[PDB]
Amino acid sequence: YSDRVAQLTIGNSTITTQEAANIIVGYGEWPSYCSDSDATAVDKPTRPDVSVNRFYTLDTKLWEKSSKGWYWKFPDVLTETGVFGQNAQFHYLYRSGFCIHVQCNASKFHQGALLVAVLPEYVIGTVAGGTGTEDSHPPYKQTQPGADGFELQHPYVLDAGIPISQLTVCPHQWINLRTNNCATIIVPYINALPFDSALNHCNFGLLVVPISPLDYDQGATPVIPITITLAPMCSEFAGLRQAVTQ
Amino acid sequence: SHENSNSATEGSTINYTTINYYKDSYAATAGKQSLKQDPDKFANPVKDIFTEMAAPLK
Structure with missing residues (x-):
């Protein structure tokens, strides 16, 4: 038995890893289907x-x-991807938790640390005209970036007045290049409602941001990619209709 | 003493049920055979087996 060697099999997918940290269970609570007493x-x-x-x-x-x-907004990331997004379009109501497996590996002569975090209801604010005297609002491509995600305007402020200095409150996991090469976050359905639109509302936001900068000498690899992987758990859909999008 | 026991497969683990008309049993049919396998003999001839769930090299 070991703590850093893990394998994640869901459906017909399988993720292996040999240099990981322990799995985080979100808010100490495994994802579950909706009871007949919570549903309406x-x-x-x-x-x-x-x-x-x-x-x-x-x-x-x-x-x-x-x-x-960078950041991504869930579950707008999958809405056009796979047979998950198909159900999320033909339906009005949706419910699921996710199993996010952020992954990034380098050598032993690289250094740097990422911060993977799952911030529920990550509402994004705008630079108010630089001076503060403009009630502008973010475009659709900023609040719902989807596949490619969005680069932070400013990382200190989390583009919402809140500080990244205390982001490790909500379920997080560091990717420190000298110890781990992947992070894994399991979140349940986090909402005040048993179901929601999945198109209009975004349950949370994945914040992948470096705090200690990537650095390396004149070695033989300068291209270090971070890859985002996720998997819906206990997915439920209700209120069937025609196919609707963004 | 029944009949001759000069089949090539005589005295083996395999249990054959064959048809024969002559006194010499090597002239018998190939017949029905017992289905037994042992893949580990060739596919896993390691000394200290580890579990499927286990990390082999540790």
């Missing part, structure tokens, strides 16, 4: 299981020596 919709939901509950590789950013960090 009378429709009999579809629980497609294997077809949608599986790992998805959606993006791969290049961690350069001077990067501000």
Whole structure:
């Protein structure tokens, strides 16, 4: 038995890792299907299981020596991907937790540390005209970037007035290049409602941001990519209609 | 003493059920055979087996 060697099998997907930290269970609470006492919709939901509950590789950013960090908004990342997104479009109501496996590996002569974090209801603010006298709002491509994700305007402030200096409150996991090469976060369905639109509302936001900068000598590898992988758990859909998008 | 026991496979683990008309049993049919396998003999001839779940090199 060991702590750093792990394997994650969901549906027909499988992730292996030999240099990891222990798995974080979000808020000390495993993802679950919705009870008959929490639910309110009378429709009999579809629980497609294997077809949608599986790992998805959606993006791969290049961690350069001077990067501000990126973020993704869930579950807008999958809405056009796979047979999960198909159910999320034909339906009004959706419910699921995720199994995020951020991954980034380098040599032993590289250094740097990422900060993987899952911040629920990550509302994004705008630079108010530089001076503070403009009630502007972010475009659709900033609040719902989707596949490619979005680069932070400023990383210190989390583009919302809140400090990254205390982001390790909500479920997080560091990727420190000298110890681990991947992070794994399991979150349950975090919402005040038993179901939600999945298109309009975004349950949380994945914040992949470096705090200690990537550095390396004149070695033989300067291209160090971070890759994002996720997998819906206990997925439920209700309120069937026509195919609707963004 | 029954019949002759000069089949090539005589005295083996395999249990054959064969048809024969002559006194010499090597002239018998190939017949029905017992289905037994041992893949580990060739596929896993290691000394200290580790579990499927285990990391082989540690």
